[PDB]
């Protein structure tokens, strides 16, 4: 079932090395967004937060 | 840095329904470009063009579970 | 927070066949424990117990391509 | 463009203290070999040799978090 127990939306570009977007499925009704930080740690981001939607579009532009 | 950039060749032609997960690697020092790797339903992995409008579209839709 | 592990809950029972890849993240300033995140063939992710002999044996069989 | 095996080249010599994480990718659709990628504390990625005893050993110590 869902990996992501808690989801943050208060983070800025810089610490994020990569992001992984997992689509909803029979074992999780929510989309999961896992960010890999420069330090190797992982955090779950809220996929609906407009802030987080912005962060993705930027990483995607190389900005 | 033995493993550098994974996607020198990309694609814009992917059917969103074949996509299971997406990984967006940001510009790093080791790979000075953004790489986007889609894992397909059958396990295959393909490099996507981060700049193609369509790909930007598909990412935003996946994110919204649209 | 200071302690921000991702793996709150851990399992020891998964059958090797369902595992695609595994990531082992060492102890850090922000996480007092070793985290093992398994990526299943369906794209689902689950935290494994690094201390469980069942788990150590799975890692070894994966490595051996066994 | 399709992504198969990431590791053209491998090494059996890394010092454990430079390793921040390890990813073990089992044999799959598009890569009929096991691949081990270490992410160093400086973010570089190195392909490790999964058959080399020294590597098999590093993985188990990283698991035990020793």
Curated annotation (Swiss-Prot), chains B, C, D:
Q: Cystine bridges: which residues?
A: 5-31, 7-47
Taxonomy, superkingdom = Eukaryota
Name this protein carries in UniProt: Neutrophil-activating peptide 2(1-66)
The encoding gene: PPBP
